[PDB]
Amino acid sequence: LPPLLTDEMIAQYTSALLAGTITSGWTFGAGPALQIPFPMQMAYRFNGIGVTQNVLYENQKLIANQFNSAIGKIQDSLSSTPSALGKLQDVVNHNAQALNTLVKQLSSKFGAISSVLNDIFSRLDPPEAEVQIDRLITGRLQSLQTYVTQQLIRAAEIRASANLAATKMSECVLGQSKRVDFCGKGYHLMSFPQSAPH
Amino acid sequence: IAIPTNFTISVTTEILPVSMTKTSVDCTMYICGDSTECSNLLLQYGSFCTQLKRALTGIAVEQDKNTQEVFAQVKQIYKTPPIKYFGGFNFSQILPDPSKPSKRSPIEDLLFNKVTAARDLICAQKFKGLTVLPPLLTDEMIAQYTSALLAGTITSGWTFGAGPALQIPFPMQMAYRFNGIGVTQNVLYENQKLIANQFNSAIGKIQDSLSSTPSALGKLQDVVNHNAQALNTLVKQLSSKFGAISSVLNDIFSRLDPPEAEVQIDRLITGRLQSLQTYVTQQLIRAAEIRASANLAATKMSECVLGQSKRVDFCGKGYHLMSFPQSAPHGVVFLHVTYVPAQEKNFTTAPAICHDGKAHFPREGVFVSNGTHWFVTQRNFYEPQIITTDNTFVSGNCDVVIGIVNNTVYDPLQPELDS
Amino acid sequence: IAIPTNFTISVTTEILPVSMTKTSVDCTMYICGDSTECSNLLLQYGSFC
Amino acid sequence: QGVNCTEVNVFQTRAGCLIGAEYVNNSYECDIPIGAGICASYQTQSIIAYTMSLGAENSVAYSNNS
Ligand SMILES: *[C@@H]1O[C@H](CO)[C@@H](O[C@@H]2O[C@H](CO)[C@@H](O)[C@H](O)[C@H]2NC(C)=O)[C@H](O)[C@H]1NC(C)=O
Ligand SMILES: *[C@@H]1O[C@H](CO)[C@@H](O[C@@H]2O[C@H](CO)[C@@H](O)[C@H](O)[C@H]2NC(C)=O)[C@H](O)[C@H]1NC(C)=O
Ligand SMILES: *[C@@H]1O[C@H](CO)[C@@H](O[C@@H]2O[C@H](CO)[C@@H](O)[C@H](O)[C@H]2NC(C)=O)[C@H](O)[C@H]1NC(C)=O
Ligand SMILES: *[C@@H]1O[C@H](CO)[C@@H](O[C@@H]2O[C@H](CO)[C@@H](O)[C@H](O)[C@H]2NC(C)=O)[C@H](O)[C@H]1NC(C)=O
Ligand SMILES: *[C@@H]1O[C@H](CO)[C@@H](O[C@@H]2O[C@H](CO)[C@@H](O)[C@H](O)[C@H]2NC(C)=O)[C@H](O)[C@H]1NC(C)=O
Ligand SMILES: *[C@@H]1O[C@H](CO)[C@@H](O[C@@H]2O[C@H](CO)[C@@H](O)[C@H](O)[C@H]2NC(C)=O)[C@H](O)[C@H]1NC(C)=O
Ligand SMILES: *[C@@H]1O[C@H](CO)[C@@H](O)[C@H](O)[C@H]1NC(C)=O
Ligand SMILES: *[C@@H]1O[C@H](CO)[C@@H](O)[C@H](O)[C@H]1NC(C)=O
């Protein structure tokens, strides 16, 4: 089945979040949006982490250059190591593998003499066809139930991950966090979201 | 820049499921009821009914653990004073109602009523070996815990959750919370009446909103419906052949010989055991999900009710002020009271002030200008003030910062020196 | 005591899964196939669907 | 469990019927959980059944300017 939200709408949502956090600070997440110059917002965040305002105002150019250099380097860092996006690939591979096992399960004899119904029906009498069909039905019901059970477990795991992602989006993007190592490694300044397949 | 000039007090509701329904199953009487033939043949299948009972007992004790962990978080039972004057705030709509014999509150009753010869379905289910155990804590005990929590947070603030309970007037507690969110306390001390009126109006609006709409408690009803659906499916599973000649077994023994009856009985035993195993597995998964929800509810109770939280969008929408808990069938309801700005205005700012060849930065607020003059004001509220040396600090000359303006800085000492 | 004198701005990446593919299955198509007699026998068996 | 023991000391509780335990009118912290707000304990060389106690009792002196 297809998802309800197309990728265009998700990209629109991310762009709206980026514009809101760039041009308004953390105000748009707690009521009416109020504009503020970006350097002043950075001064507010520096004051939040425990550094006086003048430090930013006397070193604006160096901080801007460092930020630009980091934004430049991250793109190259994402373009070389293929193990960075392992998790989504693992999810896709696991789902495809489960489906492949389920579809391949059909050819099994399940103790009977053949896996094709027409041959048993046109070659054997109905009284034994009863037990052969019973065997095949039991096997296929067991396979379907197994598939459903693992699907439920995996869905629960994915729901937990989605809840954690929602909490991170609500706390590190719409505001500034004091929790340690929750939104990075160091003293948190800000965060930006992007969308990826699933 | 934009600066707000007014505020609003808002109340929001959140519903969280906590516990489930405890069930127990009787193996043999479910599988074959009162047939001695099954009573004999089942035994050679070993013992599938030790681990099933073990798992069901584990779920049953886990439910009580969840409820006790979520609700039992106060060492003592507090009581409100007989007089109900709290500086203008009207908490009469959430405090326990003494007239009613159930000792509940005017909302908890709405929650309980909202969630809901011939034979009842419960009796029919019980007549198949499925019994329902009662919870350890009665509803009166849960209401007592909720009332104790409400009295403690109203009377003492957040002090009772970290040691000995310390009393404090409610107005000063609200001033402390306002100072916590980043607004000075003179705002409260000047707008006490308006804030109390807004609080009462919000409480009444929550009253009406819960009273009118009857579809705001979907989660608890969904849990109940899922449990009922599982039990109904298990009951209906008994009237199928499972590959045998007939479902009812007395006919199986009467019509045919013992040899073929053995095969039919084996088929029925295997089918019914498989159905029970699947039911137990689904119950385990649902119990895990309910436990996760109960852990979240316990964390929210610890962090929003017993204190003030700076986590964004955790205890409501806006700047958190406080919270109130209420009970509900197999769940809890949180009322979050928060603070939002309104009536913003445009202003022009500058990073610093270059006066006497020195750069000046604000100490706590921010610099603004109403077109002609310049003031310093707090960030979350409009309160202009004359720029002095008391609320400003100096560092470096004024040829490094970008966007500085000149103005002047008034020193409140020289006028006294000249007179 | 030790006190810092310079700083560095750093950018770190985090990846989180959100959703999973949605699937649906058909009882008779998977189990029986294209034979109607199998469907007639199977409909007597249960309502696992 | 869940059996009216008039068609089975005896005590008829919400969970069923209890035999061998003497009902008292005091209140203690729960030792062995029975159900529906009823617990049991071994106390006094005897076995007793009672209702749970939800902790101690306290009141805080609240006033306008204290
Ligand atoms: C902030 O908002 C409140 C609520 O709207 C304003 O209080 C109102 O004041 C008018 C007088 O102009 C009264 O007629 C209303 O009854 C008041 N509302 C309430 C709920 O009592 C308040 O004036 C606003 N503050 C400012 C500075 O404009
Ligand atoms: C606090 O709120 C309650 C409920 O909103 C008020 O109770 C009302 O009292 C008046 C009497 O003047 C009755 O006519 C209303 O019917 C009551 N409300 C309801 C919902 O029944 C109460 O007056 C308020 N103030 C105090 C001090 O308790
Ligand atoms: C900006 O604010 C200042 C002070 O808050 C205003 O200055 C006063 O404006 C009033 C007008 O009601 C005059 O009567 C006073 O004489 C002014 N004081 C001084 C020292 O000049 C100023 O008018 C405001 N600018 C606006 C509203 O455009
Ligand atoms: C603030 O005032 C100072 C002094 O009144 C201005 O500094 C003068 O700048 C001009 C050219 O920009 C020079 O020719 C003068 O010699 C400076 N005077 C002094 C005493 O340094 C300054 O320009 C003013 N600020 C702005 C933004 O114009
Ligand atoms: C603090 O660190 C910054 C960058 O990490 C240093 O800036 C470098 O300074 C050298 C020497 O002047 C230049 O060659 C580099 O180009 C600068 N880097 C950048 C990105 O511009 C700075 O010198 C360090 N020390 C102080 C006191 O700021
Ligand atoms: C705290 O202040 C309240 C508000 O005045 C007092 O309540 C008043 O008590 C008197 C005497 O019983 C009544 O006549 C008034 O009607 C009450 N006020 C209201 C608004 O109803 C209360 O007595 C004070 N308590 C202390 C300890 O000083
Ligand atoms: C502030 O100025 C902009 C400039 O056009 C205007 O659009 C905006 O409405 C102003 N702010 C308010 C609160 O009116
Ligand atoms: C138990 O049986 C007695 C006698 O019939 C009856 O009076 C009483 O109400 C019954 N109690 C319950 C809980 O069924």
Author numbering:
A (entry chain C): 861 to 1058
B (entry chain B): 712 to 827, 845 to 1147
C (entry chain C): 712 to 760
D (entry chain A): 613 to 620, 641 to 676, 690 to 711
What does the literature reporting this entry say, word for word?
As the spike glycoprotein of SARS-CoV-2 mediates the virus entry into host cells, it is the main target of NAbs and the hotspot for designing therapeutic agents and vaccines. Omicron carries the most significant number of mutations among all SARS-CoV-2 variants to date, with 37 mutations within its spike protein, 15 of which are positioned at the RBD and cover almost all the critical mutation sites carried by previous VOCs, such as K417N, S477N, E484K (E484A in Omicron), and N501Y. To delineate the impact of emerging mutations on spike’s properties, we performed systematic structural analyses on apo Omicron spike and its complexes with human ACE2 or S309 neutralizing antibody (NAb) by cryo-EM.
To test whether the three substitutions of Omicron (S371L, S373P, and S375F) are critical for its stable one-RBD-up conformation, we generated Omicron-S-L371S/P373S/F375S mutant protein with the three residues (L371, P373, and F375) replaced by those (S371, S373, and S375) in the prototypic spike. The purified mutant protein was incubated with hACE2 in the same way to determine the cryo-EM structure. In addition, the three-RBD-up conformation of hACE2-bound mutant Omicron spike with reverse mutations (L371S, P373S and F375S) reveals the three emerging substitutions of Omicron (S371L, S373P, and S375F) play a crucial role in stabling the one-RBD-up conformation of the spike to fight against the conformational alteration triggered by ACE2 binding.
